[PDB]
Amino acid sequence: DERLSKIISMFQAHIRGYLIRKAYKKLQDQRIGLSVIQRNIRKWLVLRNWQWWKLYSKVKPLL
């Protein structure tokens, strides 16, 4: 009864553990991925606001 209930919950906890541990590698890979995205977009944003890039960009069409 209360014992059965506890045992069942412990089994569900094993399941909860399994699922989250399974998801771990994907979360690690994705942190790498989101890091790359965030970093390169920012680099792009900084570049776009760099006067030299603004000058270079406006000049290109004449090449």
Partner 1 sequence: PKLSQDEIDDLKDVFELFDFWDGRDGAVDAFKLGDVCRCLGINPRNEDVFAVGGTHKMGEKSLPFEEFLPAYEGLMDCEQGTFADYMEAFKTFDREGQGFISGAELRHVLTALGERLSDEDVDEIIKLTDLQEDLEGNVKYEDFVKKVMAGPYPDK
Partner 2 sequence: ADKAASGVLTKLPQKQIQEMKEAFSMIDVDRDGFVSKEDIKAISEQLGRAPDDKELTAMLKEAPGPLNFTMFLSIFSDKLSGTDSEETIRNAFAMFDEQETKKLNIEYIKDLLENMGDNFNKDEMRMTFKEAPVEGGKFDYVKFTAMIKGSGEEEA
- For residue 9, the partner it binds in partner 1, partner 2, none, with Cβ less than 5 to 8 A by kind, is partner 1
Q: Which is nearer to partner 1, 8 or 47 (CB)?
A: 8
CB of 31 to partner 1, least distance (A): 5
Q: Which is nearer to partner 1, 28 or 57 (CB)?
A: 28
Distances (CA, A) of 18 to 21, 22, 31, 39, 41: 5, 6, 21, 32, 35
Binding site for partner 1 (CB under 8 A): 4-22, 24, 27-28, 31, 34
